[PDB]
mmCIF file of C-alpha atoms in Angstrom:
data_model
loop_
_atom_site.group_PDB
_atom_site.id
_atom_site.type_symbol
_atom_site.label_atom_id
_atom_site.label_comp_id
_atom_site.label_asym_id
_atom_site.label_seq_id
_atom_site.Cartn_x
_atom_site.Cartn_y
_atom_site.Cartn_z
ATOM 1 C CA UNK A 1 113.777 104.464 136.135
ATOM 2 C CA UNK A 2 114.210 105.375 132.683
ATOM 3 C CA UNK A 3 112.843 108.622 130.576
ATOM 4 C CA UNK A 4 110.688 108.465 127.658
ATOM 5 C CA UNK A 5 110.499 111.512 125.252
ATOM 6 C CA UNK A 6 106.814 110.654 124.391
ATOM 7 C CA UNK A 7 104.832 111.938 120.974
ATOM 8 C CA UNK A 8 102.973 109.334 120.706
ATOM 9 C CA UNK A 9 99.346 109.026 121.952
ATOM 10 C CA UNK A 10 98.791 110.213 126.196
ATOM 11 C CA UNK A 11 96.670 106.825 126.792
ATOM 12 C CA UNK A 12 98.659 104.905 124.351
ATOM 13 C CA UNK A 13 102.044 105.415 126.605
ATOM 14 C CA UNK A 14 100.710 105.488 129.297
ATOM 15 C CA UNK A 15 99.449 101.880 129.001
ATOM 16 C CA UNK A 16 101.977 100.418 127.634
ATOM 17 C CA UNK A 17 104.541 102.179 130.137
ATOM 18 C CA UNK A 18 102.500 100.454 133.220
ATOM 19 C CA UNK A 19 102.771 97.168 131.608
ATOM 20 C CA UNK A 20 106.239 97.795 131.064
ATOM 21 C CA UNK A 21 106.594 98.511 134.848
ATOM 22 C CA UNK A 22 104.183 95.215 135.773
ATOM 23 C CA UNK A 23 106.886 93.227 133.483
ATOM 24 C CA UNK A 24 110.045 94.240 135.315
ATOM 25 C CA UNK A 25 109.155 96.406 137.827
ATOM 26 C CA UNK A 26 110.771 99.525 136.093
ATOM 27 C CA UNK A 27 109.462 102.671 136.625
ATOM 28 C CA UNK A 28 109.087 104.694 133.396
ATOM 29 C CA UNK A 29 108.859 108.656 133.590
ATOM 30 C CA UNK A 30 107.016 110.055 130.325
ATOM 31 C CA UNK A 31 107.304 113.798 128.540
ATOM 32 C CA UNK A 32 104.586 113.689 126.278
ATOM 33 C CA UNK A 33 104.943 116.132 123.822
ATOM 34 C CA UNK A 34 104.874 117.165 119.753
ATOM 35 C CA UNK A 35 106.979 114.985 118.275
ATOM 36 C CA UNK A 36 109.038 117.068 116.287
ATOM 37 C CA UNK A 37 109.430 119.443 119.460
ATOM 38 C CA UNK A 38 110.981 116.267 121.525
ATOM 39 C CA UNK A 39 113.204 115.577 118.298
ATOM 40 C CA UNK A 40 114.627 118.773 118.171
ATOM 41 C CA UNK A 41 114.276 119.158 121.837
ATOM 42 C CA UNK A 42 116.876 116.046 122.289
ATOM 43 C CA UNK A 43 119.133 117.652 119.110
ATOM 44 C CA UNK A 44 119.365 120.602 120.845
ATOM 45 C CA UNK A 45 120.890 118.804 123.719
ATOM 46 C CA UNK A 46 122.537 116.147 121.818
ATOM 47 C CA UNK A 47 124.468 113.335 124.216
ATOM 48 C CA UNK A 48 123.175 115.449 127.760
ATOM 49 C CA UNK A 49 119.543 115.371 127.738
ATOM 50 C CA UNK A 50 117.502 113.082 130.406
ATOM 51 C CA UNK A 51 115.985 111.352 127.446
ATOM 52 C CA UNK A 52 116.159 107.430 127.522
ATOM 53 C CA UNK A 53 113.667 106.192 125.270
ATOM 54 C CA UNK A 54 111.712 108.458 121.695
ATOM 55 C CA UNK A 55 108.526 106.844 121.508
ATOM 56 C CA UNK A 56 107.481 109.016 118.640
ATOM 57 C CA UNK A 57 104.296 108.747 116.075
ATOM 58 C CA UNK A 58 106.016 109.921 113.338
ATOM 59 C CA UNK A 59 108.916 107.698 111.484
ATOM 60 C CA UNK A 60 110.517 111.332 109.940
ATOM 61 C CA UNK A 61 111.460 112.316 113.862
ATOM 62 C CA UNK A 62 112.720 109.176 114.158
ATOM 63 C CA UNK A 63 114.595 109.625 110.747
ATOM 64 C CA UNK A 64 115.941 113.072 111.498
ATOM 65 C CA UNK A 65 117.409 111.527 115.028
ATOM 66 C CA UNK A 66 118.722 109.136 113.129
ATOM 67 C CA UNK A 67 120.684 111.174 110.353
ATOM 68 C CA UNK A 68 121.963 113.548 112.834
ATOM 69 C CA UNK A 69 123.284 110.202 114.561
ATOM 70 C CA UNK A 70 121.716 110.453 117.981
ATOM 71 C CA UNK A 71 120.377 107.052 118.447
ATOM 72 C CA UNK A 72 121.708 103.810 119.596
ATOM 73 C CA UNK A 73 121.597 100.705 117.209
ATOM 74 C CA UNK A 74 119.149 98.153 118.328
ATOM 75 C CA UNK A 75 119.294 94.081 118.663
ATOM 76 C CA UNK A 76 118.282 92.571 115.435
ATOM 77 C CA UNK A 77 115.848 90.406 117.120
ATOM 78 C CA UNK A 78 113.803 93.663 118.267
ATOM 79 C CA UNK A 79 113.563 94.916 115.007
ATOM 80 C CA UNK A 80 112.545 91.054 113.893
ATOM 81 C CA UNK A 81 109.725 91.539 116.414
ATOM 82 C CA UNK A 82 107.609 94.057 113.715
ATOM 83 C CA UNK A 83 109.005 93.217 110.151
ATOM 84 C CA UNK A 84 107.480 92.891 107.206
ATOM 85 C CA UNK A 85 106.901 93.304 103.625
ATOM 86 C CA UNK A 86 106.288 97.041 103.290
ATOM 87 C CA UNK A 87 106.944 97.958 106.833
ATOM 88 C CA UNK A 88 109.801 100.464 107.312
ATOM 89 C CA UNK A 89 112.870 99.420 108.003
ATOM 90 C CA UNK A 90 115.733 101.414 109.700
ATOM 91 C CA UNK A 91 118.380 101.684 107.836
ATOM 92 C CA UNK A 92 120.887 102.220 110.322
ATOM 93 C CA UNK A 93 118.917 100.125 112.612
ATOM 94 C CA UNK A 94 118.936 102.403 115.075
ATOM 95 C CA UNK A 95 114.904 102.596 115.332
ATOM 96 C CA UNK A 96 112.378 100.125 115.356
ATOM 97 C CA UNK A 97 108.754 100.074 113.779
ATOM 98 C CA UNK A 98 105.834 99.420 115.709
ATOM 99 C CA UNK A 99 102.198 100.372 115.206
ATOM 100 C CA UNK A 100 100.097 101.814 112.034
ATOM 101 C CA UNK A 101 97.045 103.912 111.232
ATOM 102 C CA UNK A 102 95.469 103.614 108.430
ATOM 103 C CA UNK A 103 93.029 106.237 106.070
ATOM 104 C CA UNK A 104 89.998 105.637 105.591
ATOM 105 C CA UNK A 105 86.230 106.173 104.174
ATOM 106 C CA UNK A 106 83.401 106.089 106.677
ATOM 107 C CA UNK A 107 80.060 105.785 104.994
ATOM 108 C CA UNK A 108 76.351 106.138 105.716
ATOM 109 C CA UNK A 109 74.838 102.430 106.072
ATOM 110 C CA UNK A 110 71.466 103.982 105.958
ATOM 111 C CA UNK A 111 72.264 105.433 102.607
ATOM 112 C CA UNK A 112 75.077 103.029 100.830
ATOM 113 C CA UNK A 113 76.615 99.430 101.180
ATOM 114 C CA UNK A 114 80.181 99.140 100.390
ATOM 115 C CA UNK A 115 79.245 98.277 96.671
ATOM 116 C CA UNK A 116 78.481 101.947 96.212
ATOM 117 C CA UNK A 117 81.981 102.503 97.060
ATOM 118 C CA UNK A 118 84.671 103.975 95.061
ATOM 119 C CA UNK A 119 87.466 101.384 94.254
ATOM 120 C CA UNK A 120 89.960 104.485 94.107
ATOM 121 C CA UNK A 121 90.079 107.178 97.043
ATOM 122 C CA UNK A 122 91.288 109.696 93.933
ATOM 123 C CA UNK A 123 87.646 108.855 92.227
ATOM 124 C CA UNK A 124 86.093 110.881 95.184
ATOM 125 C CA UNK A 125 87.027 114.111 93.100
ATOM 126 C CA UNK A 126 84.585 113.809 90.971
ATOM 127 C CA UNK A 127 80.848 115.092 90.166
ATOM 128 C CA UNK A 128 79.234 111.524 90.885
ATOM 129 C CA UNK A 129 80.653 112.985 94.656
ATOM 130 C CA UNK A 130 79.264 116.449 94.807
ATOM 131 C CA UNK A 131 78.198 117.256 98.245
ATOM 132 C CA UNK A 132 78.794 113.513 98.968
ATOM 133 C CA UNK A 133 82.037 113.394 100.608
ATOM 134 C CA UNK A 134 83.951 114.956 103.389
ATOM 135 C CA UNK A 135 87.079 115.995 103.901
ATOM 136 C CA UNK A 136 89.553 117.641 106.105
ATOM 137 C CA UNK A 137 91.882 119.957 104.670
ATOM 138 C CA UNK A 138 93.597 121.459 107.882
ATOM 139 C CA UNK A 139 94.316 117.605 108.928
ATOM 140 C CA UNK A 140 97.502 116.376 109.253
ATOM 141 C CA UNK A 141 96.628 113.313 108.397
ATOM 142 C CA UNK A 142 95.475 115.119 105.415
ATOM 143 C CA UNK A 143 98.532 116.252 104.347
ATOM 144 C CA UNK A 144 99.847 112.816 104.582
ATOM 145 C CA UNK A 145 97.530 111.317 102.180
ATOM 146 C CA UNK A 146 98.902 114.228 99.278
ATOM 147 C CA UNK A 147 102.378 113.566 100.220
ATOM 148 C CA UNK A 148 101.682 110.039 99.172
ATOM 149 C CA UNK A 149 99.302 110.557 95.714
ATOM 150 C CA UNK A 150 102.215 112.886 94.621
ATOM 151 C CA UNK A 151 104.804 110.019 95.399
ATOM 152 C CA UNK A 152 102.690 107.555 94.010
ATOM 153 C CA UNK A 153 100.889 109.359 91.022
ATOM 154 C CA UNK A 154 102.958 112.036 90.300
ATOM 155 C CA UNK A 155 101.660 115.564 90.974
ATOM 156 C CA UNK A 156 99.170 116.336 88.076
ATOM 157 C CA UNK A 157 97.369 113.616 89.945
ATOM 158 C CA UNK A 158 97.436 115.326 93.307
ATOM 159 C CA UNK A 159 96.415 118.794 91.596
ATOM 160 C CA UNK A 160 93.344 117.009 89.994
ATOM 161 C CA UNK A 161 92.687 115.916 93.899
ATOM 162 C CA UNK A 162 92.781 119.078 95.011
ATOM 163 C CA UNK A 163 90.859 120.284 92.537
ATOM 164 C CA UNK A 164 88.033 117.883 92.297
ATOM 165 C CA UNK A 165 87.375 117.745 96.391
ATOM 166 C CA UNK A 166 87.776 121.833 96.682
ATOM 167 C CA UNK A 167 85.031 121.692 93.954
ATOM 168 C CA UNK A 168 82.863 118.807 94.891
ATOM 169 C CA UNK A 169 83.585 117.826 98.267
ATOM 170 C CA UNK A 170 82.522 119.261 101.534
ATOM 171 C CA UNK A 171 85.515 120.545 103.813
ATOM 172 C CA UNK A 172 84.853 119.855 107.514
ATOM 173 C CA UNK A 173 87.236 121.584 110.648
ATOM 174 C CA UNK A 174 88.247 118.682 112.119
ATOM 175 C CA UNK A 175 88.323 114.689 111.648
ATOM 176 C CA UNK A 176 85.495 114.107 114.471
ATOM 177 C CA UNK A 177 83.341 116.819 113.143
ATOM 178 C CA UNK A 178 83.197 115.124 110.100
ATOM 179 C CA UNK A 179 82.809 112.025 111.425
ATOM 180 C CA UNK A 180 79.702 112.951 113.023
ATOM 181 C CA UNK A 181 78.275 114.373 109.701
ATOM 182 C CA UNK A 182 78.221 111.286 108.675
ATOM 183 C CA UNK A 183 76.807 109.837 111.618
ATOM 184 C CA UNK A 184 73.891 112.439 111.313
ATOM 185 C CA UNK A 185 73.197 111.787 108.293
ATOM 186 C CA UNK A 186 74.486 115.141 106.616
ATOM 187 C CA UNK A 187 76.816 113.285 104.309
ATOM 188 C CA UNK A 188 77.064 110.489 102.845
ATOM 189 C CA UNK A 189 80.894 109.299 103.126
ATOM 190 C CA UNK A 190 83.983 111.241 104.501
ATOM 191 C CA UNK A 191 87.774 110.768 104.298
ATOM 192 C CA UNK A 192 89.428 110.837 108.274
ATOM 193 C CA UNK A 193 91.308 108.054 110.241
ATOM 194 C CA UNK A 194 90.561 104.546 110.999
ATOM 195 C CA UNK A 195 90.889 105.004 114.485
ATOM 196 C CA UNK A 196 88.105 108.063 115.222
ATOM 197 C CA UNK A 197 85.662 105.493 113.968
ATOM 198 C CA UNK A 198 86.359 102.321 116.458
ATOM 199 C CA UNK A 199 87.316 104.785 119.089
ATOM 200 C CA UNK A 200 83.588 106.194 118.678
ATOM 201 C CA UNK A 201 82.118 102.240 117.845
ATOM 202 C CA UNK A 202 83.668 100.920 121.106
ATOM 203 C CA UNK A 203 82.131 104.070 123.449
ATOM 204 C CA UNK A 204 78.400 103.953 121.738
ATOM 205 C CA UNK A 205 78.359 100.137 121.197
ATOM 206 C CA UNK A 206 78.092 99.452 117.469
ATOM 207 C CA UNK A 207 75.083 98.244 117.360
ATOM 208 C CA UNK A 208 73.607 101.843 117.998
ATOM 209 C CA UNK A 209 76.112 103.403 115.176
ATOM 210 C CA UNK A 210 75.201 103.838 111.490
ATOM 211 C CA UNK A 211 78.804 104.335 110.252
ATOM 212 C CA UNK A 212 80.772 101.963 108.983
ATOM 213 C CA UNK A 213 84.804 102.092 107.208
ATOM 214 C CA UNK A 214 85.564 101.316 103.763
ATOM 215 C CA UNK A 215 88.910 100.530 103.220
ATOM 216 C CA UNK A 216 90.600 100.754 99.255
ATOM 217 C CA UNK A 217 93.484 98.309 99.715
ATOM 218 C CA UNK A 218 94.951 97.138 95.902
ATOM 219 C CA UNK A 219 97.898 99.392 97.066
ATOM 220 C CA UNK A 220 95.675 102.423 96.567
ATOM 221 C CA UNK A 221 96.936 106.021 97.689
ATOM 222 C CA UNK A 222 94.024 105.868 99.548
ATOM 223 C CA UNK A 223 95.149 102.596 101.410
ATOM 224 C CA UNK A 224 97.844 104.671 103.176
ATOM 225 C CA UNK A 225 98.903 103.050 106.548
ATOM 226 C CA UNK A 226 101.170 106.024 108.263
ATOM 227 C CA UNK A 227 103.905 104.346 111.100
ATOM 228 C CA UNK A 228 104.873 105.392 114.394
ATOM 229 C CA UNK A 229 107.828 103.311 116.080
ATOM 230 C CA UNK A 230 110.784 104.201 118.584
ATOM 231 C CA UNK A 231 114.252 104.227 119.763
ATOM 232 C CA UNK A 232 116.586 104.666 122.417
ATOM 233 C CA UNK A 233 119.514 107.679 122.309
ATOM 234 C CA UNK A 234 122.968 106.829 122.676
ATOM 235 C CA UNK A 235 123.164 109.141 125.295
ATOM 236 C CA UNK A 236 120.978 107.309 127.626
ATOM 237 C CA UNK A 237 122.719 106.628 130.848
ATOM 238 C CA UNK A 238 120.079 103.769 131.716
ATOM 239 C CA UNK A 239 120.526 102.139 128.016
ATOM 240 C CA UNK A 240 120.140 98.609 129.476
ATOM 241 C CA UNK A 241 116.980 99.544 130.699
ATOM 242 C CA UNK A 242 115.764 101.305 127.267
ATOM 243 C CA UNK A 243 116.704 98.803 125.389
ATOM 244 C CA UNK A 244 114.469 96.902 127.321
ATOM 245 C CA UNK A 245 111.599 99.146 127.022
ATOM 246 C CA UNK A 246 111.592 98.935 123.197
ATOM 247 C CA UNK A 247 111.826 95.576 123.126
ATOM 248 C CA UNK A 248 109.135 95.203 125.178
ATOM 249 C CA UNK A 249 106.932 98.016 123.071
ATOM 250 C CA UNK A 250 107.792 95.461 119.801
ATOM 251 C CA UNK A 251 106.786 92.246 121.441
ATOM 252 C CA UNK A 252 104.056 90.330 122.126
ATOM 253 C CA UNK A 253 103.187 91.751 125.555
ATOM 254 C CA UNK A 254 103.756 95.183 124.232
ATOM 255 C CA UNK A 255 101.683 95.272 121.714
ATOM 256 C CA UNK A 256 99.079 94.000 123.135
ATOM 257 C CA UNK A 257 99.165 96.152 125.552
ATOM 258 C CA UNK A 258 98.761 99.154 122.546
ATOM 259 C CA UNK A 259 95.892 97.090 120.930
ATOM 260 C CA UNK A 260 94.081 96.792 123.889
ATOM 261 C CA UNK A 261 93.516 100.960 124.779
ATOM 262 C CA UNK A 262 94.330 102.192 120.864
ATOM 263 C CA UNK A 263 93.244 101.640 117.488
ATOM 264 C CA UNK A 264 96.324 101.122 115.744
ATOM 265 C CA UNK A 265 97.397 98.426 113.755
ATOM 266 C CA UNK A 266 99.986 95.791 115.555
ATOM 267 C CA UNK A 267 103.031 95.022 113.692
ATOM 268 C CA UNK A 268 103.938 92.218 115.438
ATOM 269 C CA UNK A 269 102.338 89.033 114.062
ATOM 270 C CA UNK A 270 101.516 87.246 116.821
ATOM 271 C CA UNK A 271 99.254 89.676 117.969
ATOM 272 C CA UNK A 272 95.273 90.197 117.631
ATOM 273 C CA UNK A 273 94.076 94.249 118.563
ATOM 274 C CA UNK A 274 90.702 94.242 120.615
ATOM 275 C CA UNK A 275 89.162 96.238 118.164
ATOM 276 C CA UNK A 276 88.167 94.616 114.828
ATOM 277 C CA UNK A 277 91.477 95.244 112.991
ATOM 278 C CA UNK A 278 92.132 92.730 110.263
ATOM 279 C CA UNK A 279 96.298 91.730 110.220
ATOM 280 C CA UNK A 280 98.000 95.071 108.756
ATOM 281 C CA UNK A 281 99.184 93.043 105.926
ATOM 282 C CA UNK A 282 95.618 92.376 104.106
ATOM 283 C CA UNK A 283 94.822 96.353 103.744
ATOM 284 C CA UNK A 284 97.442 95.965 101.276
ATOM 285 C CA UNK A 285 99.136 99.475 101.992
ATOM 286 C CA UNK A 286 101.283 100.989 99.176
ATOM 287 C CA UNK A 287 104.505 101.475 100.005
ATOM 288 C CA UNK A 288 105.737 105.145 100.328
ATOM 289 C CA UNK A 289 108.764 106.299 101.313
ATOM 290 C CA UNK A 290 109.112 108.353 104.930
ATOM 291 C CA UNK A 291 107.882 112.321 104.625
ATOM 292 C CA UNK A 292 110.443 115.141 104.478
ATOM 293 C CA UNK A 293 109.790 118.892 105.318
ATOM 294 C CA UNK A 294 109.599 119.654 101.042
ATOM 295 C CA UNK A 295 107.539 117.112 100.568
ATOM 296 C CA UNK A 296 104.798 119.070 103.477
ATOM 297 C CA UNK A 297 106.326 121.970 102.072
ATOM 298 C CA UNK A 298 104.900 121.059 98.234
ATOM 299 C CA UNK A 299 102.008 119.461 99.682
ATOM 300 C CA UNK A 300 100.732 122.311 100.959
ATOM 301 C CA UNK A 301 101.074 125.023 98.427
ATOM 302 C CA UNK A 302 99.106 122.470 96.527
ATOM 303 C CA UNK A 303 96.654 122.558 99.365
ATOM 304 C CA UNK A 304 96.566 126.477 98.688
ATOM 305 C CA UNK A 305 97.147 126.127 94.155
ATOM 306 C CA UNK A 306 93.450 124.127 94.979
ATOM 307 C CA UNK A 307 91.521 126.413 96.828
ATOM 308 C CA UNK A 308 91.535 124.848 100.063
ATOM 309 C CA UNK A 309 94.305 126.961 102.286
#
């Protein structure tokens, strides 16, 4: 019944679009996608594409929608469904905040306890770490977690990063390979997502896992929750029906319906996620403003001034 440009997670939509449909019996048709492919995909057609609803992962696609005014303002009491203190707030409210992921450190409990811990994810750059820690420098995930040091500790800070992981850390391919280092054994802590971890716990059973997440809070860079959300476009010719559909993806029903196939962090209150995901609010995220193309632009020549590209 209505379109949704999806770049969000495949299983994510897709169970959230089925309770949708057990709700009001609307039938929701889903182009998954890269989000920033959709975006432009739907600003290259402006007011004439099929697109009803952006269910997007990333708040800039969202953003750039936005500025290039595209998308239709929403009911204040969707966007009262998700807010909060440091929870991104559309200016224009035109787009609505839904679910977070957070970074993380997964450790060795064979090896350490979460005393052994560093109390600052930038302390990881250090010779106390050599051969110690992980990373993943090709992430994107990666990239958002220098974005936010430079916005939050100024570059120098984010060179010294750099520096101190290309030199003591140990670069992995991807965020699941590195995961399983530590799983192995072969490491004894690793910087990835929150949700490769209880995506893994849930499949093995805990109880037969030996990795466990660390999480920095105090408004560390390393506490960085990232925000995916959505919106419907003003040239929607089912907008009654899209409007819906995000209001459904804020609520209750909707988000539990998120929380109960993915990892990510509700933003609606009145919700509990059926993995064990404390209330967003107590990892005490910093707040950071949304990413722009300069800031992945300076990120990453940083990624290559360290050694890492």
């Amino acid at each position: 019944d209505i379109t949704v440009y999806n770049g969000q997670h495949k299983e994510a939509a897709q169970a959230v679009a089925d309770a949708f449909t057990r709700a009001t019996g609307i039938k929701v048709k889903l182009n998954s996608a890269k989000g920033d492919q959709l975006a432009g995909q739907i600003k290259e057609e402006g007011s004439r594409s099929p697109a009803d609803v952006f269910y997007s992962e990333q708040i800039p696609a969202l953003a750039t929608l936005s500025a290039a005014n595209l998308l239709e303002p929403l009911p204040a009491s969707t966007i009262n469904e998700t807010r909060g203190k440091g929870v991104p707030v559309a200016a224009k409210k035109d787009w609505v905040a839904l679910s977070g992921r957070s970074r993380v450190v997964v450790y060795d409990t064979r090896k350490l306890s979460e005393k052994d811990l560093e109390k600052s994810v930038l302390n990881y750059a250090t010779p106390k770490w050599k051969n110690r820690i992980g990373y993943v420098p090709t992430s994107g995930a990666f990239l958002e977690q220098i974005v936010a040091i430079v916005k939050l500790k100024g570059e120098a800070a984010a060179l010294k990063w750099l520096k101190g992981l290309k030199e003591y850390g140990k670069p992995y391919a991807k965020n699941s390979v590195a995961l399983q280092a530590v799983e192995n054994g072969e490491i004894d802590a690793a910087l990835i997502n929150n949700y490769y971890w209880h995506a893994f716990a849930r499949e093995k059973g805990v109880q037969n896992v030996h990795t466990r997440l660390n999480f920095v809070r105090h408004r560390d860079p390393g506490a960085l929750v990232t925000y995916s959300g959505a919106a419907v476009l003003k040239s929607s010719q089912n907008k009654d029906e899209a409007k819906k559909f995000v209001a459904f993806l804020a609520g209750k029903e909707g988000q539990r319906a998120l929380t109960a196939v993915r990892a990510e962090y509700p933003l609606n209150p009145h919700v509990v996620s059926t993995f064990n995901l404390e209330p967003i609010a107590k990892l005490e995220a910093p707040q950071v403003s949304a990413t722009t193309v300069s800031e992945k632009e300076h990120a990453t020549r940083l990624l290559e001034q360290a050694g890492m590209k």
